[PDB]
Design a protein around this nucleic acid. Structure first.
Ligand code: DCP
Ligand code: CA
Ligand code: CA
Length: 424
DNA sequence: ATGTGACGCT
DNA sequence: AGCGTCAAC
């Protein structure tokens, strides 16, 4: 029951939006800086932070004005605003630059604007057949950390010794050795990271392991500009002090009630329990999933899908700004449907496909829920006016208000989303 | 007053 | 289908 069949990697760009602005504006390079959204309210909402600024305590979600109190020198780049809304086109375009390069090595699954998983298994099998049965130089792994090593004098010093203990203990003439494969994946990943920095100027970190979750957790262990190998063997130690919240899926309510119901804190504590025990507690899927996972075993595959499955535009209208006339509602529906049209037209022309379903969603004041009503709609032509008129229609009936020019509760949110794509 | 996109459940 | 969860996009 190995869980060592695959070789999987998660690459994720270091402070991505910041790096995109720093490439464009050299003055921002090597400085405490952040990317900000909407400068009016409290200086703007910060959404990405360079590591220099992080050392001052500046975080995401922090108000730029508040960030400047921790960090007086903090430089700010501003998100482009089209049609009264934050537009992300520059980062989406920077994303496909990375995603394309990365595709040259293996098939990837776009996990976000910023990161992608890679199944390296096949590419690893092939590279061994040139290295018959030649070793692996530390020189081939210049930015790789081996989690748990060394065991048994300053930062880069220690990385080095861990790598050497790992390479020395390595069974090279055996080509089905899981640990050897991970090492081969790591060398490949060194290369794809060098290709990314060369051809884009962006730096990233990577995690190399046997499945998606380990890969991902491995990736954050040595950030930035570094990659980390997490082998099957290293899992009991890593997990034994690993807060459960840190594993992907378990950072919300399910994870919070793993802790609750079981009276544990770390992932390794899950091993005590039988698969049936966990199934009774969390469901059949969640029981099986946790039983394997706490032993470093996970089987979610790397889906072959480089591009998003939905395209969507939303805007919030908090408190005072909530929409209360219907001319107001119609105007933003149009703005949204406009950004959407252009994103969609680009998509049919770039990625050879058409969306067929339009999802409209809203929020009303006095409702803490993330939404308040989603309705679907046909999407027969990529016309902004039609879509905004159709979106209205599917929500026109959402009017508590008697007087026919005002809007019921004022609306806290509008969301338009293209979906159900088909080949063109 | 922080402001995309995937998938699970029923 | 419409709602919820998750992480982070
Ligand atoms: N809540 C969030 C999270 C992220 N992003 C955007 C800004 C980020 O730069 C990018 C990638 O998100 P990450 O969570 O990977 O964080 P960074 O890449 O900014 O930094 P790190 O080096 O910690 O990954 O997506 C955002 O707008 N809102
Ligand atoms: Ca990142
Ligand atoms: Ca990321």
């Amino acid at each position: 029951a190995t869980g060592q069949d695959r070789v999987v990697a998660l690459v994720d760009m270091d402070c991505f939006f910041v790096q995109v602005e720093q490439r464009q504006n050299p003055h921002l390079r090597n400085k405490p800086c952040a990317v900000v959204q909407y400068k009016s309210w409290k200086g703007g909402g910060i959404i990405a932070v360079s590591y220099e600024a992080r050392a001052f305590g500046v975080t995401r979600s922090m108000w730029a004005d508040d960030a400047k109190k921790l960090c007086p020198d903090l430089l700010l780049a501003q998100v482009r605003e089209s049609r009264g809304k934050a537009n992300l086109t520059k980062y989406r375009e920077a994303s496909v630059e990375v995603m394309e390069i990365m595709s040259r090595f293996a098939v990837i699954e776009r996990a976000s604007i910023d990161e992608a998983y890679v199944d390296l298994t096949s590419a690893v099998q092939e590279r061994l057949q040139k290295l018959q049965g030649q070793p692996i130089s530390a020189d081939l792994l210049p930015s790789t950390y081996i989690e748990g090593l060394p065991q048994g004098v300053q930062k880069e010093g220690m990385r080095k010794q861990g790598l050497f203990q790992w390479l020395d203990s390595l069974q090279i003439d055996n080509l089905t050795s899981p640990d050897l494969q991970l090492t081969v994946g790591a060398v490949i990943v060194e290369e794809m990271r060098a290709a990314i920095e060369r051809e884009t100027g962006f730096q990233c970190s990577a995690g190399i392991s046997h499945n998606k979750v380990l890969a991902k957790l491995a990736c954050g262990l040595n950030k930035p500009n570094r990659q980390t190998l997490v082998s099957h063997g290293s899992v009991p130690q890593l997990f034994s002090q690993m807060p459960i919240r840190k594993i992907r899926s378990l950072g919300g309510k399910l994870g919070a009630s793993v802790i609750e119901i079981l009276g544990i804190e770390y992932m390794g504590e899950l091993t005590q329990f039988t698969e049936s025990q966990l199934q009774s507690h969390f469901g059949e899927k969640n029981g099986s999933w946790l039983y394997a996972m706490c032993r470093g075993i996970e089987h979610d595959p790397v889906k072959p899908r480089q591009l998003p499955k939905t395209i969507g535009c939303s805007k919030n209208f908090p408190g005072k700004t909530a929409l209360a006339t219907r001319e107001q509602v119609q105007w933003w529906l149009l703005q949204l449907a406009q950004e959407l049209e252009e994103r969609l037209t680009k998509d049919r022309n770039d990625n050879d496909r058409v969306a067929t379903q339009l999802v409209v969603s809203i929020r009303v004041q006095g409702d803490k829920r993330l939404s308040s009503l989603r309705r679907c709609c046909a999407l027969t032509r990529y016309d902004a006016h039609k879509m905004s008129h159709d979106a209205f229609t599917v929500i026109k009936n959402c009017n508590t208000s008697g007087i026919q020019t005002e809007w019921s509760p004022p609306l806290t949110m509008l969301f338009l989303c293209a979906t159900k794509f088909s080949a063109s």
